[PDB]
């Protein structure tokens, strides 16, 4: 469903983007 | 995280926790233990910032 | 010298948009060709403000109307009038509005 | 107060056609003055306002100083041979009429022109142009999207939460007992599974001496404590004077030392219809000699020969040897400073174990799923409470988050478990495609 | 006790001196104290405007409590000083700039 | 050390020196002054004070 070619989905899988709510109730929102 | 982190600091006052200072004192002497916290907070952010 | 005026006629109120009008000085402070942003006692824009008319409408039984009902001051009034024979002519401002209490005349 | 013009002689006939003269004022009553502003301009409508701008300047502030609530104008009427009757009803009036609005406090955006006469305002609530406009500070903005504010949802009610305590504990014992203690042997004593009542101990016997430090006296009956402590003695009234933390005094004060960061206060009575004798008063004891400082809320029995010469005493009583305990010497007729005074110290800690001992606040219903107010034995703030899956031990009373802040409380009463998670909040954006071309705007929470 | 509210009402006894215009000198208008030179104001105030701030909240007009006379106020020239040397292995001749 | 309780005095307190550890600094040139004033005037003895 997502076009993107195998060495993207490769690149995709390295990487690694509640710790995050626990910001989200100081005022601090991404 | 770091930033979270800086709101668990006395920065001198009596205590860290805001509602607990408002909840146990009168305005004449909450006023400076809140002023401490908000100098302490201020820095805090100024440092994030740059 | 108290007397009690008769053949009034009854009339629910009518309102009237506001508009724009309200704005006065806030501070003695001279200012020239700069914005100024303030906080104070301002009649809001675009409003419901109350409005009164005494007219001896002709005919029959026609509309008589002397509107004078006491009315709350909360923290301010605008009061505007609309003039052409000098009708409305002075203000009472009071609490109990008898000799309990001093009343400003 | 009396003011009286100039006189004058206004025109009094009745004019037909069309109203002509608008009159706007505005009456304010701040700090006990009695403002008012003042505009006059010739209009030519039958009714309504006009809608072009106008500006108020100030006429007069009178400096009177009293309420004023509720007010009512005057109107005057016609009478001539037109208007047959009596007072009551033989009368007429002109056509006239009038405008009341109430003002509220309300930020404005005011521009000034050369001559310093305002000739435009903006009013930052009216809608999101105008909160726009008064964020940039500017009456016209460009095209784009802006970050003009946040927001967040109000909450809709408010619950307290207390122990199932009711027996109501004495403090009478420790403040009406028939005799205390000595200074240097000061009694202590533990109060706990209480409902306080410091409301009608504040001012029910007319005290002397009362002053707290850490906690404000109107503030503790909203407070949850544990293990109240309290101490007692009889003193001089000069060393009252330095029973405070974070103050130096005599060996007497040495004694009895307050810790730097003390939570609570002092309470300190007169006493001379007890505590004078007509042959003198002398069972009261008090240490006048020490080797060095004492650490804060210590107690000391010890009884032994003073050795601060170079000689040892071994109990001779004799040159340079005094014995450390000396007695007071009270009677009923002696200086101002020289009555005893009955002193009763009470000390509080916080968030160290689950509260036994605050004032009586009517607990009230349990509400969820709603964020409002709360109050879980002192820990106030606001949010929606929600069942919770994460499993307490049974010593535990709540949990915290990496913040420092709490996220899970235990009910005090029926002993369950409730998270806590403020209401959603966040900022609002304007998307405006300027002033210039059109006033329309949309409106994105994000 | 209240501040700047009003035209001023009461206070002591300073007897008055006479008015100096066109040179920086230190000035008292009803508490108002600094220094600069005074001059005559051509921006027109309203009867009941006293005096005239900026932008960096410092008073620039004021009205003279006697004869009820508009003056600016502005602080005496001031600036920087810059010296030219060319070394004090050369020379010990300098110059001076004022910017 | 001994003048410090001997004679039971009435008003002792120091300014910018803890009287307990005046035992362990030396100075130089200690200057004494001496007169007599009533209750009240003992209590703005103090700097800073009118
Ligand atoms: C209440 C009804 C009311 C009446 C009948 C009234 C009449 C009135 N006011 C005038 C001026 C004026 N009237 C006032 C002030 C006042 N005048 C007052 O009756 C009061 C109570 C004040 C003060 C608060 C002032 C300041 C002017 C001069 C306006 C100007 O020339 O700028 C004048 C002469 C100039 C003209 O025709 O405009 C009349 C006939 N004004 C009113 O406001
Ligand atoms: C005008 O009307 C008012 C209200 O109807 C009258 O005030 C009343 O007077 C009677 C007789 O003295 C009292 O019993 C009532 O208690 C009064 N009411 C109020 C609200 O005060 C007033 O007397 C009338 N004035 C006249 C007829 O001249
Ligand atoms: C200003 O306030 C009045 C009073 O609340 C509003 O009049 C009401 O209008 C609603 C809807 O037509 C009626 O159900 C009420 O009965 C009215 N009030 C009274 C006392 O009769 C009026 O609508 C408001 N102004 C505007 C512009 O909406
Ligand atoms: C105005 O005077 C009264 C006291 O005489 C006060 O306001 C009253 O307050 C009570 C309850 O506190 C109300 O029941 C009354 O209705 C109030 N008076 C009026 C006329 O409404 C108050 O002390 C004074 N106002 C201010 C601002 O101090
Ligand atoms: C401002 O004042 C000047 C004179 O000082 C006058 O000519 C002018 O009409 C006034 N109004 C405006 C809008 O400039
Ligand atoms: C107090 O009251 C609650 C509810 O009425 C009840 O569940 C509880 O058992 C009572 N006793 C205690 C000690 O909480
Ligand atoms: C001590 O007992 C007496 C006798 O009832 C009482 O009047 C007094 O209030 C008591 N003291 C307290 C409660 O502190
Ligand atoms: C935009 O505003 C400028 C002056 O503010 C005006 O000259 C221009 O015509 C405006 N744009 C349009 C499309 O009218
Ligand atoms: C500058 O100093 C160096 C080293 O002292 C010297 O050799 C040189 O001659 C000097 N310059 C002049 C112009 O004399």
């Known amino acids: 469903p997502s076009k993107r070619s195998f060495i993207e989905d490769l690149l995709f899988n390295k990487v690694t983007l509640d710790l995050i709510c626990a910001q989200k109730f100081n005022g601090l929102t991404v | 995280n770091t930033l979270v982190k800086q709101l668990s600091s006395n920065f001198g006052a009596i205590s860290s926790v805001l509602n607990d200072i408002l909840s146990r004192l009168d305005p004449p002497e909450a006023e400076v233990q809140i002023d401490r916290l908000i100098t302490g907070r201020l ?3 100024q440092t994030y910032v740059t | 010298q108290c007397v009690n005026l008769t053949t009034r006629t009854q009339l629910p109120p009518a309102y009237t948009n506001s508009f724009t009008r309200g704005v006065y000085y806030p501070d003695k402070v001279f200012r020239s060709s700069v914005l100024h942003s303030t906080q104070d006692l301002f009649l809001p824009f675009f409003s419901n403000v109350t409005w009164f008319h005494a007219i001896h409408v002709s005919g029959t039984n026609g509309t008589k109307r002397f509107d004078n009902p006491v009315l709350p001051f909360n923290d301010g009034v605008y009061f505007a009038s609309t003039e052409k024979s000098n009708i409305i002519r002075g203000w009472i401002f009071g609490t109990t509005l008898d000799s309990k209490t001093q009343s400003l005349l | 107060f009396e003011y009286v013009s100039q006189p004058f002689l206004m025109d009094l006939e009745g004019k037909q056609g069309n109203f002509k003269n608008l009159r706007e004022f505005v009456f304010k009553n701040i700090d006990g003055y009695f403002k008012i502003y003042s505009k006059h301009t010739p209009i030519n409508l039958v009714r309504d306002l006009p809608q072009g701008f106008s500006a108020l300047e100030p006429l007069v502030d009178l400096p009177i100083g009293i309420n004023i609530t509720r007010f009512q104008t005057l109107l005057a009427l016609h009478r001539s041979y037109l208007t047959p009757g009596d007072s009551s009803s033989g009368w007429t009036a002109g056509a006239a009429a009038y405008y009341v609005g109430y003002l509220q406090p309300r ?7 050369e001559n310093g006469t305002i000739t435009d305002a903006v009013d930052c609530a009216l809608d999101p142009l105008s909160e726009t406009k008064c964020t940039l500070k500017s009456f016209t903005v460009e095209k784009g999207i802006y970050q003009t504010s946040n927001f967040r949802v109000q909450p809709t009610e408010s619950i307290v939460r207390f122990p199932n305590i009711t027996n109501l504990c004495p403090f009478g014992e420790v403040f009406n007992a028939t005799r205390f203690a000595s200074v240097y042997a000061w009694n202590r004593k533990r109060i706990s599974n209480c409902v306080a009542d410091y409301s009608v101990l504040y001012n029910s016997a007319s005290f002397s001496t009362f002053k707290c430090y850490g906690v404000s006296p109107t503030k503790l009956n909203d407070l949850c404590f544990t293990n109240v402590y309290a ?3 009889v003193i001089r009234g000069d060393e009252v004077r330095q029973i405070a933390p974070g103050q130096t005094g005599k060996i007497a004060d040495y004694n009895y030392k307050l810790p730097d960061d003390f939570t609570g206060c002092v309470i300190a009575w007169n ?3 007890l505590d004078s004798k007509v042959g003198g008063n002398y069972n009261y004891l008090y240490r006048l000699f020490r080797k060095s400082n004492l650490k804060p809320f210590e107690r000391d029995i010890s009884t032994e020969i003073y050795q601060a010469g170079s000689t040892p005493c071994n109990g001779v009583e004799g040159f340079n040897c005094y014995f450390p305990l000396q007695s007071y010497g009270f009677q009923p007729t002696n200086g101002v400073g020289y009555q005893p005074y009955r002193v009763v110290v009470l000390s509080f800690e916080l968030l160290h174990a689950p509260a036994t001992v605050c004032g009586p606040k009517k607990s009230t219903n349990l509400v969820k799923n709603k964020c409002v107010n709360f109050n879980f034995n002192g820990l106030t703030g606001t949010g929606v409470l929600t069942e919770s899956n994460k499993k307490f031990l049974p010593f535990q009373q709540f949990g915290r988050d990496i913040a420092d802040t709490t996220d899970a409380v235990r ?17 609002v954006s304007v998307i405006t495609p300027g002033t210039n071309t059109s006033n ?7």
């Open chain 4, 271 to 273: 006493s001379n219809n």
């Open chain 4, 231 to 233: 101490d007692s003695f």
């Open chain 4, 411 to 427: 009910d005090p009463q029926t002993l369950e478990i409730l998270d806590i998670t403020p209401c959603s909040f966040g900022g």
């Open chain 4, 440 to 446: 329309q705007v949309a409106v994105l929470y994000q």
């Open chain 2, 43 to 45: 820095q805090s952010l």
């Open chain 4, 107 to 113: 930020t404005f955006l005011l521009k000034y022109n």
